[PDB]
Amino acid sequence: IKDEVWDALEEVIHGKVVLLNRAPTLHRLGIQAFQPVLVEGQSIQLHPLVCEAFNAD
Amino acid sequence: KEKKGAGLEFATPEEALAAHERGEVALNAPIKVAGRETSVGRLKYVFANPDEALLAVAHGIVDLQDVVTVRYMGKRLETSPGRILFARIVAEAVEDEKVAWELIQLDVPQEKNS
Amino acid sequence: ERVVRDSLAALYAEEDGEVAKVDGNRIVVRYEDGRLVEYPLRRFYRSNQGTALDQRPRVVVGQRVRKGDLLADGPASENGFLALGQNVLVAIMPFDGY
Amino acid sequence: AEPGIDKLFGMVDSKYRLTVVVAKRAQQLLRHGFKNTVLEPEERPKMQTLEGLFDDPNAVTWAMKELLTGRLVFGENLVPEDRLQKEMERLYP
Amino acid sequence: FGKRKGEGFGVDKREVEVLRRAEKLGLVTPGKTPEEQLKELFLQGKVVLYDGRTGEPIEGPIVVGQMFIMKLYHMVEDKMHARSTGPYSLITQQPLG
């Protein structure tokens, strides 16, 4: 995996959106779509506000 | 709101605007004090621009929670630079500065319900 | 201190005496009764869970130990106390959204 | 937020109508060459590495920013089924 | 604090400001010396702290100290999934492997 590949990978998504699901999904807002941002680390990073939405701590 | 310091009146005393003010500078009554109607901080620090009051806070002369006098959209207002800062935040967020000041409430703090 | 000994974590001394050979594989013990009994120090034994169980020596060659005194540390022991983590300098305060 | 969605949700009767419109637009925009776009001279979606969104990174972006202008028209029955498909592959590569 | 007081340093301007605010907060007593104010704060477990990324002092004393923290048996690498297309099963076409 070199620079080329990564840059191209940003070129494949752009406006592309992914679906994120919670553990016990219960109500409609149980799954939310977001636009992926290639961040480091290993864990999934999620916005604070939609926590209460599908009850995530 | 702190200790009364010394005396608690300017509901109407015409002398209290020019006299009592000096008192705080002496040592009498501190800044954001319920010295009735207003407080020294509302007399001493009258900021022209709404923005300028915020520039002042960066120079540690008035905290973001001290009650002073500002001028948003042309009229005298009794409030903290923090509150007016919130107002401006709500403004610049959605760009429409008119409804910005109208939708919020600048008379109480902000909580869950607010 | 009682936890580590009763849980069979580390290895203690069985009888009074001096230190013979502090190896990373063994500790030999000078029992006053003309006996040096052999102790294995076992470095990497896969726990049932997935962690690792290590024993590391704690006395140096040529020292007098006592009956019931440690000779090494268990997978969760620092000088004979229960060590299940770290002592970090923590500041309790809000920080960005992190 | 997305490119002026309140204009969009209001531009139609049902919110799902918009989804289907945007979708099928993107489809025929990708399938019959990315040239049957209706706002390609200056007012056109662009990207960040080079400015190469002028070609073909996203199909939906283009549809959404397309409907923003009165260039196209949706509806139930507008064009005969087969004819549309045929002439849409004729007029473009 | 004695280390500093001896070394040739003293009450930082920042510490002064923080103390000044702590007064209106009501942790320190009004009237003592900056050193004594800091003593009172240090009694309640609280102490001046600098932002680090700015150097502007956190206007308000906070409690610091060393507490005990373990790392739990869970990790992340134990639980990590990210496959797009891969193995299926002969018995069932639902993907796993």
Next chain:
Amino acid sequence: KAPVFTVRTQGREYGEFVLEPLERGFGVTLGNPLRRILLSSIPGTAVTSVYIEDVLHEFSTIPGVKEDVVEIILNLKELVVRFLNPSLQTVTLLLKAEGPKEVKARDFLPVADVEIMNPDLHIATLEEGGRLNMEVRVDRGVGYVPAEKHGIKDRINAIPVDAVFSPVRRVAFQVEDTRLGQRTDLDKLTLRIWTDGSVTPLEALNQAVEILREHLTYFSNPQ
């Protein structure tokens, strides 16, 4: 590597500057010092103290002139002037008008090499028999100083006016995250500047950079 500087500037007051890619941590390390300098260092001008003819106290009211003294004092703080030569350290502006007119920042009489960068600022509306003779002081301070700190008694019973020297109205910076193929934790500096019209955001910034350099050259001669 090497970071590009990108300008999106609107007129003479607001400007948005973005400098990227940056090394991890250098974003705030660079963005924070400049903001402290911009809000405190830049040489500007302001109304230090004012003397009106029938005004004794700061909290007074003069009949014939609609607006209370204080509100006028605020507008005095709202103007912005510029000196042509460095010689002009302290200059007094001078004004006089009566009747159903209105005073704007242009009515002040031009004293030598003094330029009023902002004219149509409304000073005060006057009624019939509305007499208004007042004078203004202008120094070249640096930042903001509360009136109750200086109070330049130019005349006898002149009024202390909070001096708003700082040309910039306000300055705010943010460090977002940009990636470089490999790593994503590359800091991204976006700094926005608000001035009064005396000087473009760009000018303020250049001034800041210089001010920081001159300070980095002090750690050269040990003793």
Next chain:
Amino acid sequence: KAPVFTVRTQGREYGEFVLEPLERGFGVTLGNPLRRILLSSIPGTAVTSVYIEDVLHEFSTIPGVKEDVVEIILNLKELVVRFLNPSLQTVTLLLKAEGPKEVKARDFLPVADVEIMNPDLHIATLEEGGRLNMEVRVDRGVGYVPAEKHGIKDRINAIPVDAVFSPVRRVAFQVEDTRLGQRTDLDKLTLRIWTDGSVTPLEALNQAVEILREHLTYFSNPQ
């Protein structure tokens, strides 16, 4: 009114630097930005990879050694190998001994322009007939470089070590006042720097100054 600069470097490890006076709050406007670069940047020198006589993987033991391989290696990170010239990029130190003796770091085989400022460091205690023969490769990089990244295979069974490149160990600034009996609100900067020896605090501060300067130059040509 020109900033005086003063130095109090007690030895090679500790350093103290004083600037006085500065106008308004400019003490912190300089203290922190230096502190950032002092702890982030600056070239350091550390142990990159180590090869042991018989040891293959990191998780072994050695006959005659109290500390297992990992614990021994762990001691090598707290070792300061100071070079002399920029040419030295990859100095591969070597060491071997036996018999009951605490192998102090002062036992390494000395090299041309290379001096270890950390002589008392405990590597491993040797037992009756305990022998060790190892190659400790030393590199010159910047910042925290995780062993899991570079994977410098010196030999074939050489085990990579966390690269800790940061000669400065601690930084703390204080802001006092006085001087110039005119304006009382003044700044007095005092920057304290703690380093491991490989770079004396003075050199470090200078390098940091250079970094900040260079970065300040980047705001030059817009788009």
Next chain:
Amino acid sequence: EAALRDLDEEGVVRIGAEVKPGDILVGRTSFVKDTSLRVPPGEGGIVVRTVRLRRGDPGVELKPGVREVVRVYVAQKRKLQVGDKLANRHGNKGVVAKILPVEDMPHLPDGTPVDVILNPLGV
């Protein structure tokens, strides 16, 4: 042959080698297509021990049909990274969010930074 650079013994991979997701751990085939044992998409690491229970087994069980088993002990050391679970004795669970470098971290008047930052809103 590049994939076999680790394969030391006749069938068994060497001890002390580095195996990665997709690396060949054991080599063997059946009816001749490769049905060997490779390192799963998770992670390998460094091999520390290799046990083999042949047919000539000095008193073992061994499953029906099987002739010999090959078990590998692949060890690896993992550091605290963003996502690991942290807690105390008083009971505050919580994942790690961000590992701010030494510089931009809350530090005392003394040159001492802070190690961990706990939100008071959890108390």
Next chain:
RNA sequence: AUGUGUGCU
């Protein structure tokens, strides 16, 4: 592929 059990949510 089902059951038992534990762990986390």
